[PDB]
Amino acid sequence: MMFLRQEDFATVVRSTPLVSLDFIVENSRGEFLLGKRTNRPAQGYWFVPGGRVQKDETLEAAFERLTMAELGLRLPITAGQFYGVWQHFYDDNFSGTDFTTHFVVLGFRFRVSEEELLLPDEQHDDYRWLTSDALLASDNVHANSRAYFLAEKRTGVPGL
């Protein structure tokens, strides 16, 4: 694996696509999990949870590390239903406005129980649950997350 220093990470984001896993998480009430992005890229929006795959890390191992990191619950890849290969492009990057961010994204859908998500207490306001219709009505949910809930957008996604 490899967590890069700020300088190396800058070069990578500037030079090449990142790969990420996105979690479309449903609770027992048919609502979907959303987290807020306070930093760049694309600060000021709500996103489904997810994260980046590191150098020499398998998808299987990334799924377990990322579900634990993002949701407070370690899940195996077999728990998620694969939901297509998506692409996320952003004007900015974690460090500012000098270059763009590009993700190639593997989506996964699965159900959890709200109780089992063990996150730090002070982070509980960083998340909210919305039904599909409500999340599609919100001004605040980024297009890259709205996309998972629009039939129009599913068209031509490899794996769907």
Ligand X SMILES: OC[C@H]1O[C@@H](O)[C@@H](O)[C@@H](O)[C@@H]1O
Known binding-site residue numbers for Mg(2+): 50, 70, 123
51 and 88 in contact (C-beta within 8 Å)?
A: no
72 interacts with, out of its own copies, ligand GDD, ligand X, none, CB within 5 to 8 A per kind: none
Q: Alpha-carbon distance 18 to 14, whole Å?
A: 10
In whole angstroms, the minimum distance from the beta carbon of 80 to its own copies comes to 9
Q: Which residues contact 118 (CB under 8 A, 6 or more apart)?
A: 72, 73
The residue among 135, 41, 36, 148 whose CA lies nearest residue 85 is 148
Helix (H, G, I), strand (E, B) or coil at 41: coil
Which residues are part of a known binding site for substrate? 3-4, 9, 37
Mark the segment that binds ligand X (CB under 6 A) among 1-9, 33-41, 77-85, 140-148: 33-41
Closest CB to ligand GDD among 4 and 61?
A: 4
Mark the segment that binds ligand GDD (CB under 6 A) among 44-52, 56-64, 71-79, 148-156: 44-52
Residues that bind Mg ion (CB under 5 A): 51
